[PDB]
Scaffold this active site. Structure first.
Site, PDB file in Angstrom:
ATOM      1  CG  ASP A 150      61.977  -1.851  54.860  1.00  0.00           C
ATOM      2  OD1 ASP A 150      60.782  -1.813  55.227  1.00  0.00           O
ATOM      3  OD2 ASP A 150      62.679  -0.802  54.876  1.00  0.00           O
TER       4      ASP A 150
ATOM      5  CG  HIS B  34      49.963  -4.135  57.730  1.00  0.00           C
ATOM      6  ND1 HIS B  34      49.248  -4.238  58.906  1.00  0.00           N
ATOM      7  CD2 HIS B  34      49.136  -4.597  56.752  1.00  0.00           C
ATOM      8  CE1 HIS B  34      48.049  -4.719  58.628  1.00  0.00           C
ATOM      9  NE2 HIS B  34      47.945  -4.950  57.322  1.00  0.00           N
ATOM     10  CB  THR B  35      56.844  -3.770  55.594  1.00  0.00           C
ATOM     11  OG1 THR B  35      57.936  -2.859  55.747  1.00  0.00           O
ATOM     12  CG2 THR B  35      57.013  -4.629  54.349  1.00  0.00           C
TER      13      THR B  35
ATOM     14  CD1 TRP C 188      50.899  -0.220  59.782  1.00  0.00           C
ATOM     15  CD2 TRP C 188      50.244  -0.199  57.608  1.00  0.00           C
ATOM     16  NE1 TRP C 188      49.610  -0.698  59.700  1.00  0.00           N
ATOM     17  CE2 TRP C 188      49.178  -0.697  58.395  1.00  0.00           C
ATOM     18  CE3 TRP C 188      50.061  -0.107  56.217  1.00  0.00           C
ATOM     19  CZ2 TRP C 188      47.975  -1.075  57.823  1.00  0.00           C
ATOM     20  CZ3 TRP C 188      48.845  -0.487  55.645  1.00  0.00           C
ATOM     21  CH2 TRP C 188      47.806  -0.973  56.456  1.00  0.00           C
TER      22      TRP C 188
ATOM     23  CG  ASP D 193      49.472  -2.691  62.683  1.00  0.00           C
ATOM     24  OD1 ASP D 193      49.544  -3.748  62.018  1.00  0.00           O
ATOM     25  OD2 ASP D 193      48.989  -1.643  62.172  1.00  0.00           O
TER      26      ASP D 193
ATOM     27  CB  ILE E 225      61.001  -0.346  50.125  1.00  0.00           C
ATOM     28  CG1 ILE E 225      61.341   0.713  49.053  1.00  0.00           C
ATOM     29  CG2 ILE E 225      62.229  -1.114  50.614  1.00  0.00           C
ATOM     30  CD1 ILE E 225      61.811   0.076  47.744  1.00  0.00           C
TER      31      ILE E 225
ATOM     32  NE  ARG F 125      42.534  -4.743  51.726  1.00  0.00           N
ATOM     33  CZ  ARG F 125      41.499  -4.114  51.186  1.00  0.00           C
ATOM     34  NH1 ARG F 125      41.634  -3.390  50.078  1.00  0.00           N
ATOM     35  NH2 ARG F 125      40.283  -4.196  51.727  1.00  0.00           N
TER      36      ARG F 125
ATOM     37  CG  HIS G 259      41.569  -9.552  52.312  1.00  0.00           C
ATOM     38  ND1 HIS G 259      40.557  -8.643  52.534  1.00  0.00           N
ATOM     39  CD2 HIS G 259      42.550  -9.253  53.185  1.00  0.00           C
ATOM     40  CE1 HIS G 259      40.933  -7.812  53.479  1.00  0.00           C
ATOM     41  NE2 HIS G 259      42.140  -8.145  53.877  1.00  0.00           N
TER      42      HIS G 259
HETATM   43  C1  HEM Z   1      46.884  -9.118  61.324  1.00  0.00           C
HETATM   44  C2  HEM Z   1      45.658  -8.863  60.985  1.00  0.00           C
HETATM   45  C3  HEM Z   1      45.415  -7.796  59.903  1.00  0.00           C
HETATM   46  C4  HEM Z   1      44.510  -6.821  59.937  1.00  0.00           C
HETATM   47  C5  HEM Z   1      43.598  -6.484  61.127  1.00  0.00           C
HETATM   48  C6  HEM Z   1      44.625  -6.040  58.733  1.00  0.00           C
HETATM   49  C7  HEM Z   1      43.895  -4.911  58.423  1.00  0.00           C
HETATM   50  C8  HEM Z   1      44.176  -4.090  57.359  1.00  0.00           C
HETATM   51  C9  HEM Z   1      43.510  -2.895  57.011  1.00  0.00           C
HETATM   52  C10 HEM Z   1      42.329  -2.345  57.874  1.00  0.00           C
HETATM   53  C11 HEM Z   1      44.074  -2.394  55.906  1.00  0.00           C
HETATM   54  C12 HEM Z   1      43.748  -1.117  55.107  1.00  0.00           C
HETATM   55  C13 HEM Z   1      42.868  -1.359  53.865  1.00  0.00           C
HETATM   56  C14 HEM Z   1      42.554  -0.027  53.193  1.00  0.00           C
HETATM   57  O1  HEM Z   1      41.871   0.781  53.856  1.00  0.00           O
HETATM   58  O2  HEM Z   1      42.934   0.150  52.062  1.00  0.00           O
HETATM   59  C15 HEM Z   1      45.116  -3.257  55.464  1.00  0.00           C
HETATM   60  C16 HEM Z   1      45.875  -3.042  54.359  1.00  0.00           C
HETATM   61  C17 HEM Z   1      46.873  -3.896  53.936  1.00  0.00           C
HETATM   62  N1  HEM Z   1      47.111  -5.184  54.422  1.00  0.00           N
HETATM   63 FE1  HEM Z   1      46.397  -5.892  56.208  1.00  0.00          FE
HETATM   64  N2  HEM Z   1      45.598  -6.617  57.981  1.00  0.00           N
HETATM   65  C18 HEM Z   1      46.063  -7.727  58.621  1.00  0.00           C
HETATM   66  C19 HEM Z   1      47.001  -8.584  58.115  1.00  0.00           C
HETATM   67  C20 HEM Z   1      47.587  -8.554  56.895  1.00  0.00           C
HETATM   68  C21 HEM Z   1      48.389  -9.623  56.310  1.00  0.00           C
HETATM   69  C22 HEM Z   1      48.492 -10.965  57.061  1.00  0.00           C
HETATM   70  C23 HEM Z   1      48.891  -9.196  55.160  1.00  0.00           C
HETATM   71  C24 HEM Z   1      49.750  -9.904  54.096  1.00  0.00           C
HETATM   72  C25 HEM Z   1      50.852 -10.499  54.427  1.00  0.00           C
HETATM   73  C26 HEM Z   1      48.424  -7.856  54.932  1.00  0.00           C
HETATM   74  C27 HEM Z   1      48.702  -7.025  53.933  1.00  0.00           C
HETATM   75  C28 HEM Z   1      48.170  -5.779  53.765  1.00  0.00           C
HETATM   76  C29 HEM Z   1      48.650  -4.869  52.788  1.00  0.00           C
HETATM   77  C30 HEM Z   1      49.790  -5.040  51.803  1.00  0.00           C
HETATM   78  C31 HEM Z   1      47.797  -3.661  52.873  1.00  0.00           C
HETATM   79  C32 HEM Z   1      48.007  -2.387  52.007  1.00  0.00           C
HETATM   80  C33 HEM Z   1      46.986  -2.398  50.858  1.00  0.00           C
HETATM   81  C34 HEM Z   1      47.169  -1.152  49.943  1.00  0.00           C
HETATM   82  O3  HEM Z   1      48.126  -0.507  50.005  1.00  0.00           O
HETATM   83  O4  HEM Z   1      46.219  -0.961  49.184  1.00  0.00           O
HETATM   84  N3  HEM Z   1      47.688  -7.524  56.021  1.00  0.00           N
HETATM   85  N4  HEM Z   1      45.091  -4.286  56.379  1.00  0.00           N
HETATM   86  K   LIG Z   2      58.632  -0.451  53.917  1.00  0.00           K
END
Ligand code: HEM
Ligand SMILES: [K+]
EC number: 1.11.1.11
Length: 249
Positions: free
Chosen positions: A186, A162-163, A178, A207, A184, A37, A41
């Site tokens: 996947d 988000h996997t 998710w 999503d 992991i 993330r 970002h």
């Molecule tokens: C498609 C549009 C997307 C939206 C609207 C979105 C929105 C969000 C939100 C609201 C969260 C939760 C943050 C929290 O409360 O800790 C999140 C977490 C996360 N996002 Fe996204 N996201 C998007 C795309 C992406 C992309 C493109 C990636 C990377 C390839 C990504 C990777 C992640 C990951 C790994 C987390 C987990 C963070 C953690 O575990 O602390 N996301 N996202």
């Molecule tokens: K997974």
């Protein structure tokens, strides 16, 4: 259309050593999702028409960290600073994108190609360019396509990031993972999306938008059925994302 810059041999040596140290550090701290993330970002602010934003090291600036979209990413930046300081020759820009690549690898994902050379730029972009979790497909295309310049295929595969990981009520306000195996990498993100709402697991409105859009839904189905196809398209998209504005836009 990429032409990557030349970097010195010492720079390349540090990339290779940083990559190894990042694997051990990220695996030990169980912070791979947060580092992905942070990389995303960092890159996701790129606006192709103006060539502003993108993966140029600005997210460590308190003004960028203060964006609401970045809530919690100050933990990530703090976590990496001691290791970064062991590689003074690398740009923060390259360092954070390398951390993103490694976060994917050490959770069992594809090997995303990495090219060094990003420079640290002085000005963060304006706030408000990252996608809004409560909107839908039209909004996703505005942000990934009209600003960043990525494809509809890239949108769905990147959503698959988000996997790994979870939302946190004190960060976005959403809460939980998710997937049942959130460290992991996947295709389970897509398989959960298809199957409905399972207790304990998270789906954002963004999503769910993938399921009802005519272009995105065939990709969700392909990725749920074929994890190898998911990994190929994921790696292509993440490389592009990590290189926005860099070595020719
Ligand atoms: C498609 C549009 C997307 C939206 C609207 C979105 C929105 C969000 C939100 C609201 C969260 C939760 C943050 C929290 O409360 O800790 C999140 C977490 C996360 N996002 Fe996204 N996201 C998007 C795309 C992406 C992309 C493109 C990636 C990377 C390839 C990504 C990777 C992640 C990951 C790994 C987390 C987990 C963070 C953690 O575990 O602390 N996301 N996202
Ligand atoms: K997974």
């Amino acid at each position: 259309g990429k032409s990557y810059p030349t970097v010195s041999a010492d720079y390349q040596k540090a990339v290779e050593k940083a990559k190894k140290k990042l694997r051990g550090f990220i695996a030990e701290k169980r912070c791979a999702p947060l580092m992905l993330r942070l990389a995303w970002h960092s890159a996701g602010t790129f606006d192709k028409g103006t060539k502003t934003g993108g993966p140029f090291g600005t997210i460590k600036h308190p003004a960028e960290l203060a964006h609401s979209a970045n809530n919690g990413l100050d933990i990530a930046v703090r976590l990496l600073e001691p290791l970064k300081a062991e590689f003074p020759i690398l740009s923060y820009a390259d360092f954070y994108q390398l951390a993103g690549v490694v976060a994917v690898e050490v959770t069992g994902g594809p090997e995303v190609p990495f090219h060094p050379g990003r420079e640290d730029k002085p000005e963060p972009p304006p706030e408000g360019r990252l996608p809004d979790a409560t909107k839908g497909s039209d909004h996703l295309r505005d942000v990934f396509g009209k600003a960043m310049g990525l494809t509809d295929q890239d949108i769905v595969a990147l959503s698959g990031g988000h996997t790994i990981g979870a939302a946190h009520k004190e960060r976005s306000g959403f809460e939980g993972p998710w997937t049942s195996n959130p460290l992991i990498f996947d295709n389970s993100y897509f398989t959960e999306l298809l199957s409905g709402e399972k207790e304990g697991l998270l789906q954002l409105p963004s999503d769910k938008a993938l399921l009802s859009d005519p272009v995105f839904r065939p990709l969700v189905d392909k990725y749920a059925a074929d994890e190898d196809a998911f990994f190929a398209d994921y790696a292509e998209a993440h490389q592009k994302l990590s290189e926005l504005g860099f070595a020719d836009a």
